[PDB]
Amino acid sequence: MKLILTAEVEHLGAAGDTVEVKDGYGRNYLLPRGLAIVASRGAERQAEEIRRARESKVIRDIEHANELKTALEGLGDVTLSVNAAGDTGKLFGSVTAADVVNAIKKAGGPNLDKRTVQLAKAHIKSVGTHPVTVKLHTGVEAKVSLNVVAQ
Amino acid sequence: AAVCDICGKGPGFGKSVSHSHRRTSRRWNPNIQPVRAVTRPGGNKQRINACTSCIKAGKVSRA
RNA sequence: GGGAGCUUGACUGCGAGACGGACAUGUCGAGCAGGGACGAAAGUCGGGACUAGUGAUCCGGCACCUCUGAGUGGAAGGGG
RNA sequence: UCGAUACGGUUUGUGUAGGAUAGGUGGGAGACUGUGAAGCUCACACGCCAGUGUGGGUGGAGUCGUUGUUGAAAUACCACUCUGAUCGUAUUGGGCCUCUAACCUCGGACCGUAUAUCCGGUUCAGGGACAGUGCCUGGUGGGUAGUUUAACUGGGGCGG
RNA sequence: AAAACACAGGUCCGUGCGAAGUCGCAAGACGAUGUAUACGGACUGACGCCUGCCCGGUGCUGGAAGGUUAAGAGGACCCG
RNA sequence: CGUGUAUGUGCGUCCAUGAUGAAUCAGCGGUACUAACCAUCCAAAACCACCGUGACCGCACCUUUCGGGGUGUGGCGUUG
RNA sequence: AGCGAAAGCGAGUCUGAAUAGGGCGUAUCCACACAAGAGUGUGUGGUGUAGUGGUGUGUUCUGGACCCGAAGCGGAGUGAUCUACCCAUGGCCAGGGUGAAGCGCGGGUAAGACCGCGUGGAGGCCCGAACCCACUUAGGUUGAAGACUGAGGGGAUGAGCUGUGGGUAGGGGUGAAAGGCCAAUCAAACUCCGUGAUAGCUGGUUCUCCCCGAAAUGCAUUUAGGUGCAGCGUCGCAUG
RNA sequence: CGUAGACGGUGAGAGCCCGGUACGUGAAAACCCGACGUCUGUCUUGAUGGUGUUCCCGAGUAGCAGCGGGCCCGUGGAAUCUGCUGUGAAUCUGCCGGGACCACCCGGUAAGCCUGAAUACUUCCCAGUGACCGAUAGCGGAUUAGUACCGUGAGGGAAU
RNA sequence: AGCUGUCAACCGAGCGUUGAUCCGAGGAUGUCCGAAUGGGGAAACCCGGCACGAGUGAUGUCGUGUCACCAGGCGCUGAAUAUAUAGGCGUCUGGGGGGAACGCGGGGAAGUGAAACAUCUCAGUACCCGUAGGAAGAGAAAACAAAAUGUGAUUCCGUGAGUAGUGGCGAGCGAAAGCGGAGGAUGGCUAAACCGUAUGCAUGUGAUACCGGGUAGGGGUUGUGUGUGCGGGGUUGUGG
Numbered sequence A: 001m002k003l004i005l006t007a008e009v010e011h012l013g014a015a016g017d018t019v020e021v022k023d024g025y026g027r028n029y030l031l032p033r034g035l036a037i038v039a040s041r042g043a044e045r046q047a048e049e050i051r052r053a054r055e056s057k058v059i060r061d062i063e064h065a066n067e068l069k070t071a072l073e074g075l076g077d078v079t080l081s082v083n084a085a086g087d088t089g090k091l092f093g094s095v096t097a098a099d100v101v102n103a104i105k106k107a108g109g110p111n112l113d114k115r116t117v118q119l120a121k122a123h124i125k126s127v128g129t130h131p132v133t134v135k136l137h138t139g140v141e142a143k144v145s146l147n148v149v150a151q
Numbered sequence B: 001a002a003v004c005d006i007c008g009k010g011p012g013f014g015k016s017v018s019h020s021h022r023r024t025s026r027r028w029n030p031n032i033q034p035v036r037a038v039t040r041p042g043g044n045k046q047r048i049n050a051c052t053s054c055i056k057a058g059k060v061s062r063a
Numbered sequence C: 001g002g003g004a005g006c007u008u009g010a011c012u013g014c015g016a017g018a019c020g021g022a023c024a025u026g027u028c029g030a031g032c033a034g035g036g037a038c039g040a041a042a043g044u045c046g047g048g049a050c051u052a053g054u055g056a057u058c059c060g061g062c063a064c065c066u067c068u069g070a071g072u073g074g075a076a077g078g079g080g
Numbered sequence D: 001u002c003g004a005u006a007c008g009g010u011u012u013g014u015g016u017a018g019g020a021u022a023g024g025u026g027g028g029a030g031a032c033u034g035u036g037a038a039g040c041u042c043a044c045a046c047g048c049c050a051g052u053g054u055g056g057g058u059g060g061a062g063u064c065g066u067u068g069u070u071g072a073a074a075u076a077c078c079a080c081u082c083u084g085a086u087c088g089u090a091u092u093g094g095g096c097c098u099c100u101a102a103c104c105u106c107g108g109a110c111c112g113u114a115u116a117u118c119c120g121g122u123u124c125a126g127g128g129a130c131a132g133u134g135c136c137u138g139g140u141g142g143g144u145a146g147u148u149u150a151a152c153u154g155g156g157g158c159g160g
Numbered sequence E: 001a002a003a004a005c006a007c008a009g010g011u012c013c014g015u016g017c018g019a020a021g022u023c024g025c026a027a028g029a030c031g032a033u034g035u036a037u038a039c040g041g042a043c044u045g046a047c048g049c050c051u052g053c054c055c056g057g058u059g060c061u062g063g064a065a066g067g068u069u070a071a072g073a074g075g076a077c078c079c080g
Numbered sequence F: 001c002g003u004g005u006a007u008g009u010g011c012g013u014c015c016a017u018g019a020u021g022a023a024u025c026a027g028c029g030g031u032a033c034u035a036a037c038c039a040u041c042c043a044a045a046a047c048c049a050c051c052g053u054g055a056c057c058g059c060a061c062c063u064u065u066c067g068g069g070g071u072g073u074g075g076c077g078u079u080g
Numbered sequence G: 001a002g003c004g005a006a007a008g009c010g011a012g013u014c015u016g017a018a019u020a021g022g023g024c025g026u027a028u029c030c031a032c033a034c035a036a037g038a039g040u041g042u043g044u045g046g047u048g049u050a051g052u053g054g055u056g057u058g059u060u061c062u063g064g065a066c067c068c069g070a071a072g073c074g075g076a077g078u079g080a081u082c083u084a085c086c087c088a089u090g091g092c093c094a095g096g097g098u099g100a101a102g103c104g105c106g107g108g109u110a111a112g113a114c115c116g117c118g119u120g121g122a123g124g125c126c127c128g129a130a131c132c133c134a135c136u137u138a139g140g141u142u143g144a145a146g147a148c149u150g151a152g153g154g155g156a157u158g159a160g161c162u163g164u165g166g167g168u169a170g171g172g173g174u175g176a177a178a179g180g181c182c183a184a185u186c187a188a189a190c191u192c193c194g195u196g197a198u199a200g201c202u203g204g205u206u207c208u209c210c211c212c213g214a215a216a217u218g219c220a221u222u223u224a225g226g227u228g229c230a231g232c233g234u235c236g237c238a239u240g
Numbered sequence H: 001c002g003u004a005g006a007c008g009g010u011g012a013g014a015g016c017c018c019g020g021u022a023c024g025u026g027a028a029a030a031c032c033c034g035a036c037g038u039c040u041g042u043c044u045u046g047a048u049g050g051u052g053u054u055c056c057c058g059a060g061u062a063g064c065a066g067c068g069g070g071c072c073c074g075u076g077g078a079a080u081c082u083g084c085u086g087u088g089a090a091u092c093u094g095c096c097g098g099g100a101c102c103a104c105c106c107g108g109u110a111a112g113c114c115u116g117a118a119u120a121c122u123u124c125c126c127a128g129u130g131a132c133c134g135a136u137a138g139c140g141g142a143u144u145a146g147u148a149c150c151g152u153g154a155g156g157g158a159a160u
Numbered sequence I: 001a002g003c004u005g006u007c008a009a010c011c012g013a014g015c016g017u018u019g020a021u022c023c024g025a026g027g028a029u030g031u032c033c034g035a036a037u038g039g040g041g042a043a044a045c046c047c048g049g050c051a052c053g054a055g056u057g058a059u060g061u062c063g064u065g066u067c068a069c070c071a072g073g074c075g076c077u078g079a080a081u082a083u084a085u086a087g088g089c090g091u092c093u094g095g096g097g098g099g100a101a102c103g104c105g106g107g108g109a110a111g112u113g114a115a116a117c118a119u120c121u122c123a124g125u126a127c128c129c130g131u132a133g134g135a136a137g138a139g140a141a142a143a144c145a146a147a148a149u150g151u152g153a154u155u156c157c158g159u160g161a162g163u164a165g166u167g168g169c170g171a172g173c174g175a176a177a178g179c180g181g182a183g184g185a186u187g188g189c190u191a192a193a194c195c196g197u198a199u200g201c202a203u204g205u206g207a208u209a210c211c212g213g214g215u216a217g218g219g220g221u222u223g224u225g226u227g228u229g230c231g232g233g234g235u236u237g238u239g240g
């Protein structure tokens, strides 16, 4: 099928480019790896590829870089915005990993991936401050205290 | 290996006919292949049988 | 039966009346017309003195014809 | 690596009436020098080696025409071009050595899992677009299956 | 009830390993918790002396320069 | 084999009694899974020399002088 | 209303170049003419044309089709309590002979070989009961018995016999192999179903009287003991 | 007597002897029916026919091919429908069908879904009927009847 | 007004106007096996867990509940391994089996006939498998038809018609259109395009942004893009 590249592929084309190829890539190499995408709507797919080029090229990390980023996120309270009435302080939805990666970009600033934020074990959905762990490598780990304000 | 795990496409039954018009019963079997696909974006892989029509139509994500 | 001349009747449309016959086959046939051969003409000529030298139907090929042609015009296919 | 396509630039035509190794042309009074051509130095091009187009090294400031014979003129120029020795691009096959990512492993480990030589998963190590399997296709095929294998006849058979 | 089968001994062929062979549509199983001094198949049949010729036929195994040959690619040419 | 009751020795939870094996402060000597390092098995890309060409030809050249064919060296070139 | 393969035409139509013959068709009969006696035709008049629907009988077609009868074929199931082989776990094998290796002693040997003697207890060893077979013969042969009995006979520590539990299933199993065995059955078990299988073959088919009354030949036949058509019977109608 | 002369029984052919028949009457409860209300939903911040373009009209589908199935149609010139495999479009001056195919005309609007009635049958219950059988008949079974019995078992299967 | 079912009576006892026997309706009890379901099992017989009572001097013993497996909702946890998933725990709600025929969708013979037989037939039959319902299936034109200003969803019945056809053109098989009827509902609803919304995934220009507009002010439906759900809106052939 015809895809749109998000990264560079040797002897294929440039990133952000709409390229026709056999279905082997669009089934076995490119689509699983994310260095391309199904080309659905022209503006849509172009924006998606170019935008993902921006996030992927910034969520990269190295081991000493990971230690530096842990030092960067060893900051203070990270405030979050999710609906919850003060009647019982009970959050109806599940505070998604995007809601915390964006939350720490708003509070402290450093960017990161929703893959690395251990959402399932936070015991979300109580109002107050709660701890969430984030891991980049085999050893490095960062603890983030995340809270919410009243609604 | 003649039922698709996705669309349930099973074999069909017909006759093989010789030059002397000597018909015998046989099966047209589906082209089901052992696929090992992901249900999640993350990439945990579970082995199923999928006909090549389902592979072509992208009903299974072999990510 | 032997010899020579010319020549294609080793025809087309038909056929009164018959022989033989379980049936299917088969066999003879004068005479009419077209267009010819030979003969001056009369006339004879629908292969061979005669009786063997053959294979039903089905299915298909081919050439010709003024037939048919699945809404209509063609075509394919069928038909004679 | 070879082949088929479309596209670009060198490059080609023994003839006798001759200043003619006369590609088929439309325009042809006027195109080619010192961004160093003429004539010399070689190769590229062929050579029926009869002779001619390109470069710089030299070179000095021209060659050319309905010139006339020549069917057809420039072989002075733009745009179309078969014959050919050619490279490259776009596209697609045939093959080859590969890579890993599909797929495969009754190779290891670990987990579901107290119990487990099942099974599934995760992961390392190996193969690998092969194999296996669908569909289409040619072979081999008493391994099996269904069946056929005449009659007359001084019984039937054998002969006929 | 035998001279027939089996047999210990002989050879030949296959099998490099969830082997080959067999039972199954498959998965799976036996082979074998074996690994070529092992396992399956074929013939011969303790022991002793030996086992001739023929490779044309038919199988088996091996090989490839050619001839022939499917599906699949090709669509010149022809027809409506 | 269980079960209840009453009594007897009688170790014990607490005290207390022993056994007790340590660690930190800091002085250190190797024992270290962690570069770089060494030896080992194999060939990354690779030349030389001997000897042949898978086919073409220039061949020592032979056979009824030349029918066919071919023992053998060489260059283009490698089943190498 | 028919002729034609059909388009079509229509008491006509087809063939054909043909008012030129023939095919099929124009209910049937009567007369009068006009043409030939090559079997009569043609035409004018007349007469005018008989089907259909119930139902009885005979025959026939499709159905099990007048009734009875195979060996066998297919589908789905049941069976290894008999027997064949295997798997687990047990039991049995009176009595008596023989006398293997091994060990020990001596002799003999350069050293061996080996022998003689002992202990020793081998073996699909020997004789022989229980047990397992089944070679001969006699009896039985509407038996005591759907395979026995009597007298002898082979094996009898082994490829032995045996109990209990289990596994293999029909084109399949199992077989030291006889086409053996797989529930008194096996060249493909049995049960039910297809199913009332099919049989050019055999058998059977039931009251009466009246009239008539054959054939056993020809031709063809995957035909020859079957059938079709002819011949030959009967009934009805026509003719005489 | 009769709106009752259906049919049985009673000591032999009974309308007036019995049960009944013709004809009427009856349901507390349960169940099946309707009907009227609560209830439920929708429609009305709103109607109508005009005038001129862009988008939309069921996609791994149609169509095409290979091998089959089924159509009266046994592969035939073989349409329509349909399975497996491969390839694989358009959104209306589209696409499908009208027996190969093409052109023109006509009919329709696939790849989304629901749907009553007219139709088939009888384990069981009620009420009847027979130019049906009448104990070797009729169900295998009028009586111990799927019983006794036969078979390891599927199963076979009486007589009275 | 008599009763204690019956074969099938005899004895022994009783009940009944204070309404029995009897009949109809609704209930209660309802051992064990059986889908059989706490576990096991050779069906109808063996062995339990837990909870609440009973009973004993205590164990023993008794009674009533409850305890299978799967599938789907919801809640908790999230192995290898981080995201997480597979899984695990709990609480609900269903499933399972039977049944004579009729329905639908699949698989699919052979005897037989063809005077042999293989195409063909038998026959899509017998049988098997999956599933129902009181009926099912089908059903609202991508249909017929033929130049008629024609029919109009489906199903079923009669014809057409043993016809056109088809067929080792063999034995055989065999329509539909049209036409006459039973019934009526020529019945309904979505998708898409656009508009609004909510949420998810990549994003901010983090700034003059969107809003039907003009005015003024603030300054984010994140500006945006996309996918999903919900609601409007649409539902067609003379095209809508």
Ligand SMILES: [Mg+2]
Pocket: none
């Ligand atoms: Mg499966």
Ligand SMILES: [Mg+2]
Pocket: B013, B014, H069
């Ligand atoms: Mg079929």
Ligand SMILES: [Mg+2]
Pocket: none
């Ligand atoms: Mg058949």
Ligand SMILES: [Mg+2]
Pocket: A023, B056
């Ligand atoms: Mg593909």
Ligand SMILES: [Mg+2]
Pocket: none
């Ligand atoms: Mg003469």
Ligand SMILES: [Mg+2]
Pocket: C010
């Ligand atoms: Mg002739």
Ligand SMILES: [Mg+2]
Pocket: none
């Ligand atoms: Mg005649």
Ligand SMILES: [Mg+2]
Pocket: none
């Ligand atoms: Mg003449």
Ligand SMILES: [Mg+2]
Pocket: none
């Ligand atoms: Mg004549």
Ligand SMILES: [Mg+2]
Pocket: C058, I170
């Ligand atoms: Mg024939």
Ligand SMILES: [Mg+2]
Pocket: C070
């Ligand atoms: Mg047509």
Ligand SMILES: [Mg+2]
Pocket: C072
């Ligand atoms: Mg036409």
Ligand SMILES: [Mg+2]
Pocket: none
């Ligand atoms: Mg023709």
Ligand SMILES: [Mg+2]
Pocket: none
């Ligand atoms: Mg492959």
Ligand SMILES: [Mg+2]
Pocket: none
């Ligand atoms: Mg293949």
Ligand SMILES: [Mg+2]
Pocket: D142
């Ligand atoms: Mg064979």
